[PDB]
Design a protein around this nucleic acid. Structure first.
Lengths: 119, 145, 121, 203, 50
RNA sequence: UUUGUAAAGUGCCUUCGAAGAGUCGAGUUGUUUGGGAAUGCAGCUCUAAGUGGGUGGUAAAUUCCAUCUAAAGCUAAAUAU
RNA sequence: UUGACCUCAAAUCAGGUAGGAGUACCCGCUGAACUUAAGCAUAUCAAUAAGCGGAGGAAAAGAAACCAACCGGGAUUGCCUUAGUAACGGCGAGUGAAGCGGCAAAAGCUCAAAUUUGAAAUCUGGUACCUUCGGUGCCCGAGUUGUAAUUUGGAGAGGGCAA
């Protein structure tokens, strides 16, 4: 079975730390027992458990940082968007929707009138 | 090489001409593609016709000037003598060729009459709305042949 | 209007203020945890009959230690895990690429009475 | 305004004022590096009609190019072929020197985009140019749409595909009966008229 | 050789751990075509060239 | 929300009407073109003009005509894969 | 003596960006020879393969210093035809386009050059706030060796008049 993620997202950092230290002792006391018997599948379902804890701690340490750079400019490069290199390049929707004021006057003065050839 | 009784044949195949053979298997296929284009654009254009008007215009050099042909656009004189301005003609759906000049009277009168028959046979929706949907004719060149 | 005296005949870069760093944001979001801690330093003990002979006779624990560790981090990880003092450490690299640490305890501690406490015997 | 007077002064280059200024500036530019930054354009009329809006994010480089023909490689002057293709000295390099200057200052400043370039000076050994590079990710250029088209990713290295003011000249691109072999670009209008067009129903 | 750098010995470690026959249980597995190990590198036949 | 005594367009008269140079063009040389007394590019050398200039596919002068504006720049779809 | 200006630097200064891969198609440079001429030195292969520089989902080209010489056409591209033609070529071997015409697709425009001078009206960065691909205030900075508004060849500007 192992630990579950929603049960770890309620606990604080101090409880997750001791939860991780107990499971890393569990790995040692199962890797000692692995050699004195022919098989031991149970070690799989303890090391996955450590993976789960090492997810949640990291997750709880990332989103907290996401709330201390909230709204302002210049958040770190692993917190801003990835998307691809070529979209993090050239013009955003504002900087490509910008048009000079003469051509704004010409867009307001003569727009494309919706017509129909019937009669 | 040269042989029995046969014309001199000129065949320009001393190159690597098999690198550059382009066979058109996609022909009927691409036709379907273009027709879907003329479907898809004909959904976007808010029921305006696909093509703009082209003017009656008189062909070039001695072989071809017996015929008459759909030109590029109306001049800045034919448009002005139709009653409407140039940029407003662009927005109405009248294509305007700014650089051609009129030195003939029958072609000028035919283009001005063509603009009158166009401007009388359209209805232009208001800028605001209420949009009486008028069931587009897809072709404007076939309507005014 | 008055000229500075120059006793040297060589002009060099003026001593300028090399300013420190103060970024607008951190280098990475979360400072990474301890990559190589005492749980990851020692991995398994070794239960070959030669290693068990050294345990029962020469007062030496025989561990399999991770390839990144050094004799400093092993001399600290045994004290952190087993609470036992540690003399000279001797780490070879096995020919299958996993490091082996012969950790010799002091005379105060028996290697068998810690070897059955950790379990392998 | 004062740019018609600079235009008409710069059109008279063998007068006494412009040959004195030529000599002083050719010495001054020869004392510096090959590719080096110019703090300010030396021909503001001629920089300005090529596109130098003097504000933040516009950069002038000044660059020497080594003058003369293109001597071929192929060591000790032997070409190992027909005596047609056997000359080594008098070969003449299909691009201009102004294109070499633009490509070099677009390789040094590699974040920047070259807009145009113009001639400033020459001696017997070198020609000296000023290239008018635009920084495309500065925020004074990425908006105000008279210049945000240089921000586009299709305009990377205009100077090394032949798209500057001397690129399209030295590619032979213009309209005309005179420019028939190269009007849509030479090699596309080569490949489209050595293509064997074969249909489904053979015409 | 008899006094080595580390990188070559690391590749010898991999060349040791690959120098073994098939596990005996794979030959019972469903949809199996692997009947032996076709990459047994001996030292008297094939030099691995580091 | 009514963004606004702002913007835009249309008609008549008067004074104007700024327009890109070591660049156009030319000599020679190499290369290329179907381009033929020099089609395009390029090296050097000479170097303009203003009712000007370029082109009008046999060099040249003389007198006209025609047709567009160079030496700065952006741009979908048809197209190739 | 202190303060500006200009030019040039230094910083693990604040924030950015470039390289490398893939390369079917594209944009350029550079560039052979086998071969064909029943030999071969121009030619031809071929403005090709190889090499190199640069992009994109298309690229390029593009709103005529064009074609024409007609009752004139109208940016570019591509297809069918012109056309194996006019022309080049030891006028040999061979090479070899373009205008017109029918069609597909059609979308046009922007700076420089004119004192806004009863008012740089323009732009960047930092800081604070927020309805945070951005908006507002304040503060430095760029910039008048000139950023905005008006105009761009087809028009257009300054005035005057009536809608």
């Amino acid at each position: 079975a192992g630990v579950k993620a929603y049960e770890l997202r309620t606990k604080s950092k101090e409880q997750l730390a001791s939860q991780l230290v107990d499971l890393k002792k569990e790995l040692a006391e199962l890797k000692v027992q692995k050699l004195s018997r022919p098989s031991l599948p149970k070690i799989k379902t303890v090391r996955k458990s450590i993976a789960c804890v090492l997810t949640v701690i990291n997750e709880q340490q990332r989103e907290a940082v996401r709330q201390l750079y909230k709204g302002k400019k210049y958040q770190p490069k692993d917190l801003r968007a990835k998307k691809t290199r070529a979209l993090r390049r050239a013009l955003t929707k504002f900087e490509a929707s910008q048009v000079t004021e003469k051509q704004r006057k010409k867009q307001i003065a003569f727009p494309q009138r919706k017509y129909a050839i019937k009669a | 090489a040269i042989s029995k009784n046969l014309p001199i044949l000129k065949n320009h195949f001393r190159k690597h001409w098999q690198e550059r053979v382009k066979v058109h298997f996609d022909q009927a296929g691409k036709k379907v593609s273009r027709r879907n284009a003329r479907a898809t654009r004909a959904a976007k254009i808010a029921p305006r016709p696909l093509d703009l008007l082209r003017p009656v215009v008189r062909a070039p050099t001695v072989k071809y000037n017996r015929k008459v042909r759909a030109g590029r656009g109306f001049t800045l004189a034919e448009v002005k003598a139709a009653g409407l301005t140039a940029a407003y003609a662009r927005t109405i759906g009248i294509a305007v060729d700014h650089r051609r000049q009129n030195r003939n009277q029958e072609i000028f009168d035919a283009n001005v009459q063509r603009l009158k028959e166009y401007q009388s046979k359209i209805i232009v929706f208001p800028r605001n709305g209420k949009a009486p949907e008028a069931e587009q004719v897809l072709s404007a060149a076939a309507t005014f042949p | 209007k008055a000229l500075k005296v120059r006793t040297s005949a060589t002009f060099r870069l003026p001593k300028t203020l090399k300013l420190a760093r103060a970024p607008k944001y951190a280098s990475k979001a979360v400072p990474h945890y301890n990559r190589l801690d005492s749980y990851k330093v020692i991995e398994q003990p070794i239960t070959s009959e030669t290693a068990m002979k050294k345990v029962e006779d020469g007062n030496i624990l025989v561990f399999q230690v991770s390839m990144k560790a050094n004799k400093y981090q092993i001399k600290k990880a045994v004290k952190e895990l087993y609470e036992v003092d540690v003399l000279k450490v001797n780490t070879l690299v096995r020919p299958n690429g996993t490091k082996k640490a012969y950790v010799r305890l002091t005379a105060d501690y028996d290697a068998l009475d810690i070897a059955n406490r950790i379990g392998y015997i | 305004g004062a740019y018609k007077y600079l235009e008409e002064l710069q059109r008279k280059k063998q007068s006494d004022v412009l040959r004195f200024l030529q000599r002083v500036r050719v010495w001054e530019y020869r004392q510096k590096n090959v590719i080096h930054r110019a703090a300010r354009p030396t021909r503001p009329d001629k920089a300005r009609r090529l596109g130098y809006k003097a504000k933040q994010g516009f950069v002038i480089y000044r660059v020497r190019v080594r003058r003369g023909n293109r001597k071929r490689p192929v060591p000790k002057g032997a070409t190992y072929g027909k005596p047609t293709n056997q000359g080594v000295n008098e070969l003449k390099y299909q691009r201009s020197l102004r294109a070499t200057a633009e490509e070099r200052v677009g390789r040094r400043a590699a974040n920047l985009r070259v807009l145009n370039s113009y001639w400033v000076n020459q001696d017997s050994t070198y020609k000296y140019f000023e290239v008018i590079l635009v920084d495309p990710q500065h925020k004074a250029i990425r908006r105000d749409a008279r210049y945000n088209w240089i921000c586009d990713p299709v305009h990377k290295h205009r100077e090394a595909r032949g798209l500057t003011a001397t690129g399209k000249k030295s590619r032979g691109i213009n309209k005309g009966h005179k420019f028939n072999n190269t009007k849509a670009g030479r090699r596309k209008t080569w490949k489209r008229q050595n293509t064997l067009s074969l249909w489904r129903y053979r015409k | 050789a008899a006094q080595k750098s580390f990188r070559i010995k690391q590749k010898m470690a991999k060349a040791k751990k690959q120098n073994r026959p098939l596990p005996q249980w794979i030959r019972l597995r469903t949809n199996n075509t692997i009947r032996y190990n076709a990459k047994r590198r001996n030292w008297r036949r094939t030099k691995m060239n580091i």
